[PDB]
Amino acid sequence: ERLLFLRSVGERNEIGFPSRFKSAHYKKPTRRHKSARQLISDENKRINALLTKANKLVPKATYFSVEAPPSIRPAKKYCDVTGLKGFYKSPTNNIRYHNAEIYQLIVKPMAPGVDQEYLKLRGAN
Amino acid sequence: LAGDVISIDKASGKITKLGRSFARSRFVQCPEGELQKRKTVVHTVSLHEIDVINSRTQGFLALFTGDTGEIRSEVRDQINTK
Amino acid sequence: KETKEVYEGEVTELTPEDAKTISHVIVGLKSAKGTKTLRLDPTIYESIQREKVSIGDV
Amino acid sequence: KAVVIDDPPLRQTPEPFDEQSAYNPQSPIAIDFGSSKLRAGFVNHATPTHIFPNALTKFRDRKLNKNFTFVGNDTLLDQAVRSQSRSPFDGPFVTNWNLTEEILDYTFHHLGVVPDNGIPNPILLTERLATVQSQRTNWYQILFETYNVPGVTFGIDSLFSFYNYNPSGNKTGLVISCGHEDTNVIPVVDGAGILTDAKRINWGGHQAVDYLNDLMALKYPYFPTKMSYLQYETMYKDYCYVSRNYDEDIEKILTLENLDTNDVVVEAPFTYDWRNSILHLFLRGPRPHDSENIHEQHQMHLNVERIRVPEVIFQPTMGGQDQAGICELSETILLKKFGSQPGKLSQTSIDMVNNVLITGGNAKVPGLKERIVKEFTGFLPTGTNITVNMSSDPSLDAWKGMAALARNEEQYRKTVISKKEYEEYGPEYIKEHKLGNTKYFE
């Protein structure tokens, strides 16, 4: 029963290859996987190619123009362990901490390779 | 220089050299506990010090030179009210 | 019988204008309940320069 | 008393099918292809007919018939079907495409539609901000080849919600959205989304839940049970709020008079004073700890992360990206654009201030409206009247906006796309209408 409970929905929620909702003609094209990282690069090089073709057109609304400018106010500094206010930064490994106990039991005896995932949160590596 | 024990004031920017630490390679000990210490102090000030300061004709050098020179009465009235 | 009016808060703009000799300085002040910009005379601007006031001071 | 966190329960009742007798071929159909949830429904109704997340998978049987086309709400039937669920969204864009028309055919079958030679219903569709040309091109190709639809429009969800909440169409206001992966700030002037001064922030609900995942993984490296994404989004939903003022609230969050109130313990499912120790307060709160009993090894504490995670939309620096927070971009929009000297506000600036609207699915967190009103009173000149509006369910407003554009008005036929117009012009086209994207250049 339970082994057929999903299968009943399977024979209720099926659609054949001659699809009713699709058109009479298909002519289905082939496409690459086309991951979202390279789409930014193709859009950037298309915009740059159109720019240098028009040069040898001011952009108004592109994906690289609605994207936010950097801040002008200096960023607040925090301890990376507890999220408290950061007073000190250890010179050996460059991690901000709050006070003495967090320093002595976190920042000093920690294993290498933990620092790069601690600084990945604010992207400082 | 390196090897020095310094007390730093953030608000007024005063640098005080307490001395050099224990490194043979005067002599004081390295401080313990927290770096950014918040300390309280208990102040004592006489009435005469405030009477000299609140008299605008002379500064606080009259407490050491001794030329206070006939401090008036209205300044004393202001000190006594305050 | 006297009155006391006081402006204090965050300095957000120090724009002085001339006409070597300044004409007036427009200073914008900011507090926790809003901002308020003011026009000021160069005599006061001399004391502002004496007090070493830049952008971001109270 | 500790609370246990489990997976959300599976839906016992499967989603139904609309009756084929009541289907109208001439009635338009509105689809919101949201990143987190997919919103669909006919124009004639106002309540959402089909609400289900945009995810799907494939099943394997012993008996080998290959009859499994499970999409969305029928993945809420067992843990095994839900665990291998794949979504069509990779980042802010869509990369795979076969699963997209599979999802759309599931939607069209569950809408109770019996078409011929394609769907004879015009499509109302929602699309993102400053979308790349490939996405618009293959959207054009996918609908106007696979579905043979006469008419389609493009529009943004934030401007759709703004058209929902003031249906005259020529108002002026500021709309801020908190989407699943992006935070957008758009100024609207005379009903036109001014896209040359809109701004985008690369943070959303998904990145916040992943931030909580990384933080709680880095807080307790010896947790024996590995937690899923779903338990994470529910403790992000249940136990997170926006602080009134961050600088004072972090300064006393581990204080003993405060830690007894806002410390939330979380129990994982399974079958020399400590009071002066700031580390022990940060780990296990105001209670003493013994690591030998089995119960508190499966325990998880939330003290500073209640307000640390929702703060990052106001300061993106702890999130990692070097962008300004919505305070600063709202401030520079209100104070150094549309003809505004700092100190003197134009009538457009005052009218945008009087009609600030905040939408988005990630606005469900408490304390957003109080914070935004407080800081808008902060940076503005004194005496300026600030009004901020809120929805009860801000994930419904965009679909209601396109439904308002369809049913409420007759000038929806201004923005439609004809098939013959597509064939005479081509994929490279954009309608410069008041409520969607604009041309990439001038």
Swiss-Prot record, chain A:
Present with 1720 molecules/cell in log phase SD medium. Belongs to the IES6 family. Keywords: Nucleus, Transcription, Transcription regulation. This is Chromatin-remodeling complex subunit IES6. Transmembrane segments: none annotated. Component of the chromatin-remodeling INO80 complex, at least composed of ARP4, ARP5, ARP8, RVB1, RVB2, TAF14, NHP10, IES1, IES3, IES4, IES6, ACT1, IES2, IES5 and INO80. Signal peptide: none annotated. Probably involved in transcription regulation via its interaction with the INO80 complex, a chromatin remodeling complex. Also involved in the regulation of telomere length. One of its GO terms (cellular component) is Ino80 complex. It is found in: Nucleus. It comes from Saccharomyces cerevisiae (strain ATCC 204508 / S288c) (Baker's yeast). It comes from the Eukaryota. The chain holds residues 28 to 162 of 166 of the full protein. The gene is IES6. One of its GO terms (biological process) is DNA repair.
UniProtKB/Swiss-Prot annotation, chain B:
Present with 3030 molecules/cell in log phase SD medium. DNA helicase which participates in several chromatin remodeling complexes, including the SWR1 and the INO80 complexes. The SWR1 complex mediates the ATP-dependent exchange of histone H2A for the H2A variant HZT1 leading to transcriptional regulation of selected genes by chromatin remodeling. The INO80 complex remodels chromatin by shifting nucleosomes. Its ability to induce transcription of some phosphate-responsive genes is modulated by inositol polyphosphates. The INO80 complex is involved in DNA repair by associating to 'Ser-129' phosphorylated H2A histones as a response to DNA damage. Probably forms a homohexamer. Interacts with RVB1 and may form heterododecamers with RVB1. Component of the SWR1 chromatin remodeling complex composed of at least ACT1, ARP4, RVB1, RVB2, ARP6, YAF9, VPS71, VPS72, SWC3, SWC4, SWC5, SWC7 and SWR1, and perhaps BDF1. Component of the chromatin-remodeling INO80 complex, at least composed of ARP4, ARP5, ARP8, RVB1, RVB2, TAF14, NHP10, IES1, IES3, IES4, IES6, ACT1, IES2, IES5 and INO80. Also belongs to the R2TP complex composed of at least RVB1, RVB2, TAH1 and PIH1. Interacts with SPT15/TBP. Disulfide bonds: none annotated. It is found in: Nucleus, Nucleoplasm. This is RuvB-like protein 2. It comes from the Eukaryota. Transmembrane segments: none annotated.
Curated annotation (Swiss-Prot), chain C:
It comes from the Eukaryota. This is RuvB-like protein 1. Disulfide bonds: none annotated. It comes from Saccharomyces cerevisiae (strain ATCC 204508 / S288c) (Baker's yeast). DNA helicase which participates in several chromatin remodeling complexes, including the SWR1 and the INO80 complexes. The SWR1 complex mediates the ATP-dependent exchange of histone H2A for the H2A variant HZT1 leading to transcriptional regulation of selected genes by chromatin remodeling. The INO80 complex remodels chromatin by shifting nucleosomes. Its ability to induce transcription of some phosphate-responsive genes is modulated by inositol polyphosphates. The INO80 complex is involved in DNA repair by associating to 'Ser-129' phosphorylated H2A histones as a response to DNA damage. Present with 11600 molecules/cell in log phase SD medium. The chain holds residues 134 to 199 of 463 of the full protein. Belongs to the RuvB family. The gene is RVB1. It is found in: Nucleus.
From Swiss-Prot, chain D:
Signal peptide: none annotated. GO terms for molecular function: enzyme regulator activity. GO terms for cellular component: cytoplasm; Ino80 complex; nucleus. It is found in: Nucleus. Probably involved in transcription regulation via its interaction with the INO80 complex, a chromatin remodeling complex. Belongs to the actin family. Present with 2170 molecules/cell in log phase SD medium. This is Actin-related protein 5. It comes from Saccharomyces cerevisiae (strain ATCC 204508 / S288c) (Baker's yeast). The gene is ARP5.
